[PDB]
Amino acid sequence: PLESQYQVGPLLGSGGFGSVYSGIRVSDNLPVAIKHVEKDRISDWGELPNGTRVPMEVVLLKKVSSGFSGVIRLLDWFERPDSFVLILERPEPVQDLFDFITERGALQEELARSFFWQVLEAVRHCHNCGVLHRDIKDENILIDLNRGELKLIDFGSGALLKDTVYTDFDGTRVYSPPEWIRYHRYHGRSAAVWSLGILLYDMVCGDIPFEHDEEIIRGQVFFRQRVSSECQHLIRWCLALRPSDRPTFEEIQNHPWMQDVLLPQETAEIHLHS
Ligand SMILES: C[C@@H]1C[C@H](N)C[C@H](c2ccncc2NC(=O)c2ccc(F)c(-c3c(F)cccc3F)n2)C1
């Protein structure tokens, strides 16, 4: 049984993704997050190695499970008559990047560099494991405040990574690329790089650059805060209108703005513990 193994704590939040609760594993008192999703609300379904019908999210989290701590670990999962329940690792203390940015405003470039580098390492891990997240954004990034380590969450809009065109999308529209808005078509890696440009702008400006479809299509970036020329260049490159003009993960990590990154513990020491 599920509610014999886990002591349910308060509701953390709910939305399109389902309902997420704080929890504790009864046996060892390990902090967990308990995600409930109704079967009717799941459009994308996957197949487990031994042919079991499960939400894509379970397939994807299983593919990215390893010792690497840049992706939230799926500890267990359960099927109920009209729902699925996922048990996820829960760092303590933790804060999502959206709340962190709301609280602190625009981030110092040294902090934004450390955070962006860790999300690039996490997204490269997903891609290397054949997983495309499709909803990279501040709300889907968790900060392990004690360790200065960032974790990617919510693979509910994800898909298996492929080299052919995607014509389906259920991620966040203001992080979606102009090829999706205009043609309902995009390729995995270049669409991920566009969302990364949106995220980097969000970190250094304290808000997203585009709100309307017309602004995404135009792709003209206005800087509302003081941002270095090198950081502005990387953002504008990730936000290139033509998908083939966007940098690869290697070109982002070799960019001059990305050099001399702080270690996660140094990041926590300078920017989080203080
Ligand atoms: C209340 C959340 C708001 C987010 N901005 C989004 C979170 C989310 C959305 C969709 N699917 C799954 C998720 N959550 C998770 O997998 C998950 C896993 C481990 C965690 F430590 C947390 C968590 C959090 F994210 C914020 C505060 C406290 C937490 F425990 N969440 C729910």
PDB file of C-alpha atoms and ligand atoms in Angstrom:
ATOM      1  CA  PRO A   1       0.000   0.000   0.000  1.00  0.00           C
ATOM      2  CA  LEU A   2       0.879   3.691  -0.564  1.00  0.00           C
ATOM      3  CA  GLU A   3      -0.655   5.628   2.401  1.00  0.00           C
ATOM      4  CA  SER A   4       0.855   3.061   4.875  1.00  0.00           C
ATOM      5  CA  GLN A   5       4.411   3.733   3.507  1.00  0.00           C
ATOM      6  CA  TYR A   6       4.010   7.565   3.405  1.00  0.00           C
ATOM      7  CA  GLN A   7       2.790  10.106   5.974  1.00  0.00           C
ATOM      8  CA  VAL A   8       1.019  12.892   3.998  1.00  0.00           C
ATOM      9  CA  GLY A   9       1.805  16.468   4.947  1.00  0.00           C
ATOM     10  CA  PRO A  10       0.359  19.719   3.609  1.00  0.00           C
ATOM     11  CA  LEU A  11      -0.604  20.513  -0.003  1.00  0.00           C
ATOM     12  CA  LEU A  12       2.370  22.385  -1.598  1.00  0.00           C
ATOM     13  CA  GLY A  13       0.481  23.425  -4.729  1.00  0.00           C
ATOM     14  CA  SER A  14      -1.800  22.345  -7.558  1.00  0.00           C
ATOM     15  CA  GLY A  15      -2.440  23.315 -11.190  1.00  0.00           C
ATOM     16  CA  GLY A  16      -2.437  21.843 -14.701  1.00  0.00           C
ATOM     17  CA  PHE A  17       0.205  19.351 -13.480  1.00  0.00           C
ATOM     18  CA  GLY A  18      -2.088  17.857 -10.764  1.00  0.00           C
ATOM     19  CA  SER A  19      -1.670  18.107  -6.950  1.00  0.00           C
ATOM     20  CA  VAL A  20       1.630  18.018  -5.071  1.00  0.00           C
ATOM     21  CA  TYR A  21       1.923  17.309  -1.301  1.00  0.00           C
ATOM     22  CA  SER A  22       4.787  17.374   1.165  1.00  0.00           C
ATOM     23  CA  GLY A  23       5.396  13.945   2.629  1.00  0.00           C
ATOM     24  CA  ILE A  24       7.595  11.665   4.758  1.00  0.00           C
ATOM     25  CA  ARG A  25       8.527   8.008   4.066  1.00  0.00           C
ATOM     26  CA  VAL A  26       7.316   6.220   7.298  1.00  0.00           C
ATOM     27  CA  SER A  27      10.276   3.723   7.505  1.00  0.00           C
ATOM     28  CA  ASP A  28      13.319   6.125   7.494  1.00  0.00           C
ATOM     29  CA  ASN A  29      11.554   9.580   7.823  1.00  0.00           C
ATOM     30  CA  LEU A  30      13.003  10.591   4.373  1.00  0.00           C
ATOM     31  CA  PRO A  31      11.442  13.852   3.045  1.00  0.00           C
ATOM     32  CA  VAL A  32       9.334  13.230  -0.104  1.00  0.00           C
ATOM     33  CA  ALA A  33       7.027  15.069  -2.537  1.00  0.00           C
ATOM     34  CA  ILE A  34       3.794  13.282  -3.423  1.00  0.00           C
ATOM     35  CA  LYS A  35       2.349  14.100  -6.846  1.00  0.00           C
ATOM     36  CA  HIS A  36      -1.220  13.045  -7.789  1.00  0.00           C
ATOM     37  CA  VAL A  37      -2.389  13.193 -11.399  1.00  0.00           C
ATOM     38  CA  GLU A  38      -5.881  12.164 -12.661  1.00  0.00           C
ATOM     39  CA  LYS A  39      -5.950   9.641 -15.567  1.00  0.00           C
ATOM     40  CA  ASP A  40      -8.387  11.892 -17.555  1.00  0.00           C
ATOM     41  CA  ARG A  41      -5.837  14.791 -17.390  1.00  0.00           C
ATOM     42  CA  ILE A  42      -3.079  12.641 -19.028  1.00  0.00           C
ATOM     43  CA  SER A  43      -2.925  12.886 -22.882  1.00  0.00           C
ATOM     44  CA  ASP A  44       0.635  11.452 -23.398  1.00  0.00           C
ATOM     45  CA  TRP A  45       1.064   7.851 -22.255  1.00  0.00           C
ATOM     46  CA  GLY A  46       4.156   5.648 -22.298  1.00  0.00           C
ATOM     47  CA  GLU A  47       5.145   1.998 -22.065  1.00  0.00           C
ATOM     48  CA  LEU A  48       7.228   0.554 -19.219  1.00  0.00           C
ATOM     49  CA  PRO A  49      10.044  -1.907 -20.312  1.00  0.00           C
ATOM     50  CA  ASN A  50       7.709  -4.860 -19.427  1.00  0.00           C
ATOM     51  CA  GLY A  51       4.735  -3.303 -21.339  1.00  0.00           C
ATOM     52  CA  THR A  52       2.713  -1.457 -18.639  1.00  0.00           C
ATOM     53  CA  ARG A  53       0.522   1.599 -19.562  1.00  0.00           C
ATOM     54  CA  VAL A  54       1.848   4.538 -17.505  1.00  0.00           C
ATOM     55  CA  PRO A  55       1.986   8.418 -17.863  1.00  0.00           C
ATOM     56  CA  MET A  56       4.968   9.598 -20.057  1.00  0.00           C
ATOM     57  CA  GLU A  57       6.284  11.370 -16.947  1.00  0.00           C
ATOM     58  CA  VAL A  58       7.001   7.984 -15.249  1.00  0.00           C
ATOM     59  CA  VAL A  59       8.820   6.680 -18.427  1.00  0.00           C
ATOM     60  CA  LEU A  60      10.952   9.870 -18.637  1.00  0.00           C
ATOM     61  CA  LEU A  61      11.854  10.049 -14.916  1.00  0.00           C
ATOM     62  CA  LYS A  62      12.907   6.361 -15.020  1.00  0.00           C
ATOM     63  CA  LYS A  63      15.155   7.068 -18.084  1.00  0.00           C
ATOM     64  CA  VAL A  64      16.974   9.963 -16.264  1.00  0.00           C
ATOM     65  CA  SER A  65      17.392   8.130 -12.857  1.00  0.00           C
ATOM     66  CA  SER A  66      21.102   7.991 -11.771  1.00  0.00           C
ATOM     67  CA  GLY A  67      23.586   9.312  -9.138  1.00  0.00           C
ATOM     68  CA  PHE A  68      23.497  12.756 -10.858  1.00  0.00           C
ATOM     69  CA  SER A  69      21.530  15.202  -8.687  1.00  0.00           C
ATOM     70  CA  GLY A  70      20.534  17.752 -11.414  1.00  0.00           C
ATOM     71  CA  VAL A  71      17.222  15.937 -12.049  1.00  0.00           C
ATOM     72  CA  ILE A  72      14.591  15.212  -9.333  1.00  0.00           C
ATOM     73  CA  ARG A  73      14.633  11.455  -8.558  1.00  0.00           C
ATOM     74  CA  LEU A  74      11.455   9.333  -8.892  1.00  0.00           C
ATOM     75  CA  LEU A  75      11.536   7.114  -5.762  1.00  0.00           C
ATOM     76  CA  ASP A  76       8.302   5.157  -6.386  1.00  0.00           C
ATOM     77  CA  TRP A  77       4.985   5.305  -8.241  1.00  0.00           C
ATOM     78  CA  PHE A  78       1.479   3.835  -7.777  1.00  0.00           C
ATOM     79  CA  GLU A  79      -1.587   3.282  -9.945  1.00  0.00           C
ATOM     80  CA  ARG A  80      -5.041   4.027  -8.455  1.00  0.00           C
ATOM     81  CA  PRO A  81      -8.462   3.517 -10.225  1.00  0.00           C
ATOM     82  CA  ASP A  82      -8.683   7.103 -11.619  1.00  0.00           C
ATOM     83  CA  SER A  83      -5.171   8.436 -10.892  1.00  0.00           C
ATOM     84  CA  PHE A  84      -1.388   7.942 -10.684  1.00  0.00           C
ATOM     85  CA  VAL A  85       0.685   8.821  -7.661  1.00  0.00           C
ATOM     86  CA  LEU A  86       4.415   9.692  -7.928  1.00  0.00           C
ATOM     87  CA  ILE A  87       6.858   9.784  -5.021  1.00  0.00           C
ATOM     88  CA  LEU A  88       9.712  12.191  -5.584  1.00  0.00           C
ATOM     89  CA  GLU A  89      12.823  13.118  -3.621  1.00  0.00           C
ATOM     90  CA  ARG A  90      12.383  16.322  -1.573  1.00  0.00           C
ATOM     91  CA  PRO A  91      15.409  18.484  -0.575  1.00  0.00           C
ATOM     92  CA  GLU A  92      14.946  20.368   2.723  1.00  0.00           C
ATOM     93  CA  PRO A  93      15.129  23.434   2.786  1.00  0.00           C
ATOM     94  CA  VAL A  94      14.039  23.990  -0.827  1.00  0.00           C
ATOM     95  CA  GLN A  95      12.650  26.859  -2.939  1.00  0.00           C
ATOM     96  CA  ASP A  96      11.615  26.931  -6.616  1.00  0.00           C
ATOM     97  CA  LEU A  97      13.483  29.435  -8.843  1.00  0.00           C
ATOM     98  CA  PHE A  98      10.287  31.447  -9.556  1.00  0.00           C
ATOM     99  CA  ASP A  99       9.856  32.189  -5.761  1.00  0.00           C
ATOM    100  CA  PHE A 100      13.577  32.882  -5.386  1.00  0.00           C
ATOM    101  CA  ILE A 101      13.483  35.462  -8.244  1.00  0.00           C
ATOM    102  CA  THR A 102      10.190  37.003  -6.946  1.00  0.00           C
ATOM    103  CA  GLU A 103      11.895  37.462  -3.470  1.00  0.00           C
ATOM    104  CA  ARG A 104      15.373  38.648  -4.663  1.00  0.00           C
ATOM    105  CA  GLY A 105      14.519  40.449  -7.917  1.00  0.00           C
ATOM    106  CA  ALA A 106      17.064  40.251 -10.821  1.00  0.00           C
ATOM    107  CA  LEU A 107      20.041  38.013  -9.952  1.00  0.00           C
ATOM    108  CA  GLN A 108      23.685  39.104  -9.799  1.00  0.00           C
ATOM    109  CA  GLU A 109      25.434  37.754 -12.938  1.00  0.00           C
ATOM    110  CA  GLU A 110      27.785  35.511 -10.850  1.00  0.00           C
ATOM    111  CA  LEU A 111      24.680  33.811  -9.334  1.00  0.00           C
ATOM    112  CA  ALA A 112      22.820  33.601 -12.693  1.00  0.00           C
ATOM    113  CA  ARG A 113      25.961  31.962 -14.218  1.00  0.00           C
ATOM    114  CA  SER A 114      26.110  29.253 -11.501  1.00  0.00           C
ATOM    115  CA  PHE A 115      22.360  28.572 -11.755  1.00  0.00           C
ATOM    116  CA  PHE A 116      22.295  28.556 -15.623  1.00  0.00           C
ATOM    117  CA  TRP A 117      25.377  26.291 -15.816  1.00  0.00           C
ATOM    118  CA  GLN A 118      23.677  23.716 -13.501  1.00  0.00           C
ATOM    119  CA  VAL A 119      20.466  23.772 -15.533  1.00  0.00           C
ATOM    120  CA  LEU A 120      22.518  23.272 -18.741  1.00  0.00           C
ATOM    121  CA  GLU A 121      24.264  20.253 -17.080  1.00  0.00           C
ATOM    122  CA  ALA A 122      20.789  18.870 -16.096  1.00  0.00           C
ATOM    123  CA  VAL A 123      19.257  19.418 -19.603  1.00  0.00           C
ATOM    124  CA  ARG A 124      22.353  17.810 -21.263  1.00  0.00           C
ATOM    125  CA  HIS A 125      21.819  14.758 -18.937  1.00  0.00           C
ATOM    126  CA  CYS A 126      18.149  14.517 -20.016  1.00  0.00           C
ATOM    127  CA  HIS A 127      19.088  14.795 -23.725  1.00  0.00           C
ATOM    128  CA  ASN A 128      21.903  12.224 -23.300  1.00  0.00           C
ATOM    129  CA  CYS A 129      19.257   9.857 -21.750  1.00  0.00           C
ATOM    130  CA  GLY A 130      16.843  10.398 -24.713  1.00  0.00           C
ATOM    131  CA  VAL A 131      14.511  12.699 -22.700  1.00  0.00           C
ATOM    132  CA  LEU A 132      13.155  16.097 -23.833  1.00  0.00           C
ATOM    133  CA  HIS A 133      11.691  18.165 -20.924  1.00  0.00           C
ATOM    134  CA  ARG A 134       9.577  20.686 -23.013  1.00  0.00           C
ATOM    135  CA  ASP A 135       8.781  22.901 -19.979  1.00  0.00           C
ATOM    136  CA  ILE A 136      12.104  24.394 -18.825  1.00  0.00           C
ATOM    137  CA  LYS A 137      11.230  27.524 -16.757  1.00  0.00           C
ATOM    138  CA  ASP A 138      11.838  29.069 -13.315  1.00  0.00           C
ATOM    139  CA  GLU A 139       8.724  27.291 -11.819  1.00  0.00           C
ATOM    140  CA  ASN A 140      10.246  23.882 -12.845  1.00  0.00           C
ATOM    141  CA  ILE A 141      13.664  24.458 -11.279  1.00  0.00           C
ATOM    142  CA  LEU A 142      14.227  23.742  -7.564  1.00  0.00           C
ATOM    143  CA  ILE A 143      17.024  25.104  -5.432  1.00  0.00           C
ATOM    144  CA  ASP A 144      18.522  22.846  -2.705  1.00  0.00           C
ATOM    145  CA  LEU A 145      19.298  25.947  -0.581  1.00  0.00           C
ATOM    146  CA  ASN A 146      21.895  24.202   1.689  1.00  0.00           C
ATOM    147  CA  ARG A 147      23.976  22.717  -1.154  1.00  0.00           C
ATOM    148  CA  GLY A 148      23.440  25.437  -3.814  1.00  0.00           C
ATOM    149  CA  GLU A 149      22.307  22.607  -6.157  1.00  0.00           C
ATOM    150  CA  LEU A 150      19.529  23.050  -8.727  1.00  0.00           C
ATOM    151  CA  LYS A 151      17.092  20.286  -9.752  1.00  0.00           C
ATOM    152  CA  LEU A 152      14.815  19.993 -12.787  1.00  0.00           C
ATOM    153  CA  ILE A 153      11.208  18.986 -11.985  1.00  0.00           C
ATOM    154  CA  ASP A 154       7.910  18.298 -13.835  1.00  0.00           C
ATOM    155  CA  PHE A 155       8.413  15.973 -16.779  1.00  0.00           C
ATOM    156  CA  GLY A 156       4.608  15.900 -17.330  1.00  0.00           C
ATOM    157  CA  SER A 157       4.842  17.805 -20.681  1.00  0.00           C
ATOM    158  CA  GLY A 158       7.998  15.949 -21.815  1.00  0.00           C
ATOM    159  CA  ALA A 159       8.556  13.418 -24.600  1.00  0.00           C
ATOM    160  CA  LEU A 160      11.146  10.980 -25.836  1.00  0.00           C
ATOM    161  CA  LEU A 161      13.853  12.958 -27.642  1.00  0.00           C
ATOM    162  CA  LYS A 162      13.698  12.448 -31.474  1.00  0.00           C
ATOM    163  CA  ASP A 163      15.431  14.082 -34.532  1.00  0.00           C
ATOM    164  CA  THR A 164      12.153  14.603 -36.450  1.00  0.00           C
ATOM    165  CA  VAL A 165       9.600  17.464 -36.034  1.00  0.00           C
ATOM    166  CA  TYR A 166       7.264  17.815 -32.994  1.00  0.00           C
ATOM    167  CA  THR A 167       3.716  19.011 -33.845  1.00  0.00           C
ATOM    168  CA  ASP A 168       2.335  18.681 -30.298  1.00  0.00           C
ATOM    169  CA  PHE A 169       3.096  20.986 -27.336  1.00  0.00           C
ATOM    170  CA  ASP A 170       1.624  21.362 -23.821  1.00  0.00           C
ATOM    171  CA  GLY A 171       4.467  23.296 -22.130  1.00  0.00           C
ATOM    172  CA  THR A 172       4.460  27.046 -21.244  1.00  0.00           C
ATOM    173  CA  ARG A 173       3.521  29.347 -24.192  1.00  0.00           C
ATOM    174  CA  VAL A 174       5.719  32.381 -23.127  1.00  0.00           C
ATOM    175  CA  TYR A 175       8.814  29.989 -23.144  1.00  0.00           C
ATOM    176  CA  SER A 176       7.768  28.375 -26.499  1.00  0.00           C
ATOM    177  CA  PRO A 177       9.664  29.290 -29.677  1.00  0.00           C
ATOM    178  CA  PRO A 178       8.454  31.405 -32.638  1.00  0.00           C
ATOM    179  CA  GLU A 179       8.363  28.292 -34.925  1.00  0.00           C
ATOM    180  CA  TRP A 180       5.767  26.767 -32.492  1.00  0.00           C
ATOM    181  CA  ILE A 181       3.670  29.994 -32.359  1.00  0.00           C
ATOM    182  CA  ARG A 182       3.807  30.452 -36.192  1.00  0.00           C
ATOM    183  CA  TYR A 183       3.739  26.873 -37.585  1.00  0.00           C
ATOM    184  CA  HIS A 184       2.921  24.473 -34.723  1.00  0.00           C
ATOM    185  CA  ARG A 185       6.309  22.823 -35.545  1.00  0.00           C
ATOM    186  CA  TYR A 186       9.655  22.642 -33.702  1.00  0.00           C
ATOM    187  CA  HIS A 187      12.702  20.427 -33.231  1.00  0.00           C
ATOM    188  CA  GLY A 188      13.681  19.272 -29.711  1.00  0.00           C
ATOM    189  CA  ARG A 189      17.163  20.735 -29.101  1.00  0.00           C
ATOM    190  CA  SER A 190      16.595  24.151 -30.753  1.00  0.00           C
ATOM    191  CA  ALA A 191      13.237  24.610 -28.927  1.00  0.00           C
ATOM    192  CA  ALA A 192      14.996  23.695 -25.599  1.00  0.00           C
ATOM    193  CA  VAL A 193      17.767  26.311 -26.353  1.00  0.00           C
ATOM    194  CA  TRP A 194      15.069  28.990 -26.992  1.00  0.00           C
ATOM    195  CA  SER A 195      13.457  28.244 -23.548  1.00  0.00           C
ATOM    196  CA  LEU A 196      16.970  28.480 -22.028  1.00  0.00           C
ATOM    197  CA  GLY A 197      17.361  32.000 -23.510  1.00  0.00           C
ATOM    198  CA  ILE A 198      13.975  32.946 -21.930  1.00  0.00           C
ATOM    199  CA  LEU A 199      15.158  31.489 -18.583  1.00  0.00           C
ATOM    200  CA  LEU A 200      18.558  33.278 -18.680  1.00  0.00           C
ATOM    201  CA  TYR A 201      16.875  36.627 -19.470  1.00  0.00           C
ATOM    202  CA  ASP A 202      14.437  35.865 -16.554  1.00  0.00           C
ATOM    203  CA  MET A 203      17.358  35.345 -14.144  1.00  0.00           C
ATOM    204  CA  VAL A 204      19.279  38.545 -15.012  1.00  0.00           C
ATOM    205  CA  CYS A 205      16.216  40.829 -15.563  1.00  0.00           C
ATOM    206  CA  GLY A 206      13.800  39.419 -12.922  1.00  0.00           C
ATOM    207  CA  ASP A 207      11.033  38.845 -15.522  1.00  0.00           C
ATOM    208  CA  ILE A 208      10.434  37.135 -18.876  1.00  0.00           C
ATOM    209  CA  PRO A 209      11.235  39.157 -22.092  1.00  0.00           C
ATOM    210  CA  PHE A 210       8.011  38.345 -24.010  1.00  0.00           C
ATOM    211  CA  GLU A 211       4.358  38.223 -22.958  1.00  0.00           C
ATOM    212  CA  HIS A 212       2.476  38.225 -26.291  1.00  0.00           C
ATOM    213  CA  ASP A 213       2.632  35.999 -29.419  1.00  0.00           C
ATOM    214  CA  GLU A 214       3.598  39.074 -31.537  1.00  0.00           C
ATOM    215  CA  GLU A 215       6.631  39.787 -29.289  1.00  0.00           C
ATOM    216  CA  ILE A 216       7.848  36.109 -29.451  1.00  0.00           C
ATOM    217  CA  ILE A 217       7.546  36.182 -33.314  1.00  0.00           C
ATOM    218  CA  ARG A 218       9.365  39.539 -33.567  1.00  0.00           C
ATOM    219  CA  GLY A 219      12.067  38.248 -31.133  1.00  0.00           C
ATOM    220  CA  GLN A 220      13.391  41.751 -30.396  1.00  0.00           C
ATOM    221  CA  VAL A 221      15.046  41.609 -26.965  1.00  0.00           C
ATOM    222  CA  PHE A 222      14.842  44.780 -24.749  1.00  0.00           C
ATOM    223  CA  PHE A 223      16.965  44.780 -21.568  1.00  0.00           C
ATOM    224  CA  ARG A 224      15.028  46.309 -18.633  1.00  0.00           C
ATOM    225  CA  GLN A 225      18.025  45.952 -16.223  1.00  0.00           C
ATOM    226  CA  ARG A 226      21.777  46.538 -16.552  1.00  0.00           C
ATOM    227  CA  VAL A 227      23.161  43.337 -18.149  1.00  0.00           C
ATOM    228  CA  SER A 228      26.755  42.810 -19.418  1.00  0.00           C
ATOM    229  CA  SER A 229      27.399  42.818 -23.186  1.00  0.00           C
ATOM    230  CA  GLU A 230      28.582  39.151 -23.059  1.00  0.00           C
ATOM    231  CA  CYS A 231      25.417  38.034 -21.187  1.00  0.00           C
ATOM    232  CA  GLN A 232      23.179  40.045 -23.608  1.00  0.00           C
ATOM    233  CA  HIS A 233      24.986  38.321 -26.559  1.00  0.00           C
ATOM    234  CA  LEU A 234      24.389  34.790 -25.181  1.00  0.00           C
ATOM    235  CA  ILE A 235      20.706  35.593 -24.514  1.00  0.00           C
ATOM    236  CA  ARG A 236      20.180  37.025 -28.027  1.00  0.00           C
ATOM    237  CA  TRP A 237      21.966  33.951 -29.525  1.00  0.00           C
ATOM    238  CA  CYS A 238      19.696  31.453 -27.631  1.00  0.00           C
ATOM    239  CA  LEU A 239      16.758  33.629 -28.849  1.00  0.00           C
ATOM    240  CA  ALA A 240      17.769  33.613 -32.552  1.00  0.00           C
ATOM    241  CA  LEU A 241      14.609  33.604 -34.746  1.00  0.00           C
ATOM    242  CA  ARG A 242      15.946  30.850 -37.032  1.00  0.00           C
ATOM    243  CA  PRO A 243      16.247  27.572 -35.033  1.00  0.00           C
ATOM    244  CA  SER A 244      19.502  26.589 -36.844  1.00  0.00           C
ATOM    245  CA  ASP A 245      21.065  29.940 -35.739  1.00  0.00           C
ATOM    246  CA  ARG A 246      20.724  28.964 -32.013  1.00  0.00           C
ATOM    247  CA  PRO A 247      23.854  27.697 -30.190  1.00  0.00           C
ATOM    248  CA  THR A 248      24.250  23.989 -29.344  1.00  0.00           C
ATOM    249  CA  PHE A 249      24.720  23.076 -25.622  1.00  0.00           C
ATOM    250  CA  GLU A 250      28.466  22.921 -26.276  1.00  0.00           C
ATOM    251  CA  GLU A 251      28.517  26.467 -27.756  1.00  0.00           C
ATOM    252  CA  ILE A 252      26.522  27.812 -24.752  1.00  0.00           C
ATOM    253  CA  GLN A 253      28.904  26.239 -22.203  1.00  0.00           C
ATOM    254  CA  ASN A 254      31.997  27.466 -24.202  1.00  0.00           C
ATOM    255  CA  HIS A 255      30.531  31.034 -24.406  1.00  0.00           C
ATOM    256  CA  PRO A 256      32.830  33.648 -22.695  1.00  0.00           C
ATOM    257  CA  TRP A 257      29.981  34.653 -20.292  1.00  0.00           C
ATOM    258  CA  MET A 258      29.886  31.004 -18.979  1.00  0.00           C
ATOM    259  CA  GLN A 259      33.571  30.735 -17.963  1.00  0.00           C
ATOM    260  CA  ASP A 260      34.849  30.435 -14.313  1.00  0.00           C
ATOM    261  CA  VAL A 261      31.523  29.153 -12.866  1.00  0.00           C
ATOM    262  CA  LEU A 262      31.246  28.950  -9.051  1.00  0.00           C
ATOM    263  CA  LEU A 263      30.934  25.448  -7.537  1.00  0.00           C
ATOM    264  CA  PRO A 264      27.431  24.736  -6.043  1.00  0.00           C
ATOM    265  CA  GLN A 265      28.746  24.881  -2.402  1.00  0.00           C
ATOM    266  CA  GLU A 266      30.599  28.214  -3.101  1.00  0.00           C
ATOM    267  CA  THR A 267      27.295  29.507  -4.633  1.00  0.00           C
ATOM    268  CA  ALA A 268      25.425  28.547  -1.430  1.00  0.00           C
ATOM    269  CA  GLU A 269      28.220  30.133   0.754  1.00  0.00           C
ATOM    270  CA  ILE A 270      28.264  33.521  -1.114  1.00  0.00           C
ATOM    271  CA  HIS A 271      24.618  33.858  -2.254  1.00  0.00           C
ATOM    272  CA  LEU A 272      22.324  31.550  -0.287  1.00  0.00           C
ATOM    273  CA  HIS A 273      23.605  30.970   3.305  1.00  0.00           C
ATOM    274  CA  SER A 274      24.294  34.746   3.741  1.00  0.00           C
TER     275      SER A 274
HETATM  276  C1  LIG B   1       4.237  23.082  -5.386  1.00  0.00           C
HETATM  277  C2  LIG B   1       5.290  22.956  -6.479  1.00  0.00           C
HETATM  278  C3  LIG B   1       5.549  24.297  -7.158  1.00  0.00           C
HETATM  279  C4  LIG B   1       6.581  24.211  -8.299  1.00  0.00           C
HETATM  280  N1  LIG B   1       6.746  25.511  -8.953  1.00  0.00           N
HETATM  281  C5  LIG B   1       6.083  23.168  -9.301  1.00  0.00           C
HETATM  282  C6  LIG B   1       5.946  21.810  -8.613  1.00  0.00           C
HETATM  283  C7  LIG B   1       5.685  20.645  -9.558  1.00  0.00           C
HETATM  284  C8  LIG B   1       4.947  20.820 -10.723  1.00  0.00           C
HETATM  285  C9  LIG B   1       4.671  19.734 -11.527  1.00  0.00           C
HETATM  286  N2  LIG B   1       5.065  18.491 -11.254  1.00  0.00           N
HETATM  287  C10 LIG B   1       5.778  18.321 -10.141  1.00  0.00           C
HETATM  288  C11 LIG B   1       6.124  19.348  -9.256  1.00  0.00           C
HETATM  289  N3  LIG B   1       6.855  19.096  -8.074  1.00  0.00           N
HETATM  290  C12 LIG B   1       7.813  18.169  -7.844  1.00  0.00           C
HETATM  291  O1  LIG B   1       8.097  17.251  -8.612  1.00  0.00           O
HETATM  292  C13 LIG B   1       8.573  18.385  -6.567  1.00  0.00           C
HETATM  293  C14 LIG B   1       9.567  17.487  -6.192  1.00  0.00           C
HETATM  294  C15 LIG B   1      10.368  17.814  -5.110  1.00  0.00           C
HETATM  295  C16 LIG B   1      10.136  18.991  -4.440  1.00  0.00           C
HETATM  296  F1  LIG B   1      10.934  19.325  -3.402  1.00  0.00           F
HETATM  297  C17 LIG B   1       9.098  19.829  -4.848  1.00  0.00           C
HETATM  298  C18 LIG B   1       8.794  21.122  -4.167  1.00  0.00           C
HETATM  299  C19 LIG B   1       8.658  22.318  -4.858  1.00  0.00           C
HETATM  300  F2  LIG B   1       8.716  22.271  -6.211  1.00  0.00           F
HETATM  301  C20 LIG B   1       8.445  23.535  -4.254  1.00  0.00           C
HETATM  302  C21 LIG B   1       8.351  23.575  -2.872  1.00  0.00           C
HETATM  303  C22 LIG B   1       8.453  22.411  -2.125  1.00  0.00           C
HETATM  304  C23 LIG B   1       8.669  21.228  -2.787  1.00  0.00           C
HETATM  305  F3  LIG B   1       8.757  20.091  -2.063  1.00  0.00           F
HETATM  306  N4  LIG B   1       8.322  19.521  -5.898  1.00  0.00           N
HETATM  307  C24 LIG B   1       4.884  21.915  -7.517  1.00  0.00           C
END
